[PDB]
């Protein structure tokens, strides 16, 4: 078990819109645009 490893940043992230609306409705959060990626599996370890 080595402690750290080099991974790769993705090129885009989820655009999150957080804003409190109203003193009784509360804090709102939303997202609309979808972003997907391809993934390998290595099935012997279940680590994509």
């Amino acid at each position: 078990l080595m402690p750290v490893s080099w991974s790769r940043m993705p090129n885009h992230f989820l655009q999150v819109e957080t804003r409190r609306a109203g003193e009784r409705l509360g804090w709102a959060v939303q997202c609309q645009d979808p972003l997907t990626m391809m993934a390998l599996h290595i099935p012997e370890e279940n680590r994509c």
Binding site: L1, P3, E45, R47
Partner: protein, 123 residues
């Protein structure tokens, strides 16, 4: 190599246990291939050995190593606790229980990310 007196085996020996920057900390050994439990549960003689579903492996702690600082068992892939202060209290274990609308329970499942024993609990 595996002999007539010894099974096929593999060891771990410390290189620098003497002086000159002898590093020592609690390292974690996992093997490389998993075993797979069957899809549904059940719910030597050549007859018994060709129908059996139960398996055995073995470790042998050498002399000069304390079983107080040895933990042996089984580990599922979603386990990433890397600490030098690990004791068996520091094992994740979550108990899931479900019941009816009456409140009487139906099942009590415990998932743990680690299934081991303590070698210090025998010697």
């Amino acid at each position: 190599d595996g002999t007539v007196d010894t099974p096929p085996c593999l060891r771990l020996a410390h290189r620098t246990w003497g002086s000159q920057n002898s590093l020592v900390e609690m390292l974690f050994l996992r093997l490389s291939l998993p075993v797979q439990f069957h899809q549904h549960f059940r719910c030597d003689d050549p007859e018994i050995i060709l129908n059996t579903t139960t398996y055995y492996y073995s470790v042998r702690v050498f002399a000069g190593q304390e079983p107080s600082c040895v933990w042996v068992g089984w580990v599922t892939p979603d386990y990433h606790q890397h600490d030098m202060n690990f004791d068996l209290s520091k094992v994740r274990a979550v108990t899931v229980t479900m019941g009816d609308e009456q409140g009487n329970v139906h099942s009590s499942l415990k998932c743990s990310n680690c299934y081991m024993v303590w070698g210090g609990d025998f010697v």
